[PDB]
Design a protein around this nucleic acid. Sequence first.
RNA 1: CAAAGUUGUGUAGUGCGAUCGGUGGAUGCCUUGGCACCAAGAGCCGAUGAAGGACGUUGUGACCUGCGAUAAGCCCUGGGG
Length: 69
Amino acid sequence: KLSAAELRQLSGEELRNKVRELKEELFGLRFQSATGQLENTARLREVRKDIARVYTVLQERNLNIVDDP
RNA sequence: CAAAGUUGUGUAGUGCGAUCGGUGGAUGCCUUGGCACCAAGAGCCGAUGAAGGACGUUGUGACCUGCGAUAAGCCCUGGGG
Ligand SMILES: [Mg+2]
């Protein structure tokens, strides 16, 4: 899974929790990469892409491009 | 055999020719680059912060191109497969 437009079915607070969880996962991945672990390197970019998606949804809600749930 | 006389000279090197190579990158044939134009556009950008940059950004060392900590990319829409 890589997240998609179903993030628009979530609420603001749980989307922000999603942001925090994604940031923590990226932190762990970066530490693994530094320490020599993390064979799965593509996730290291996909997590940042997911953060971008969640910020996209939040900003469209904030700017009223899409009606806020 | 002696006497008198004649002629000859490449083991150092060199010249010329032929031949076989080396160096060199001319020539010929090209080209992801230029040059001069034609036709149609567009003729402004900027405090909603420009022109141009610095630094950063990739699974990984650099540089170029793109991008800006949402960082060779995020979303919507249409096309295409
Ligand atoms: Mg003209």
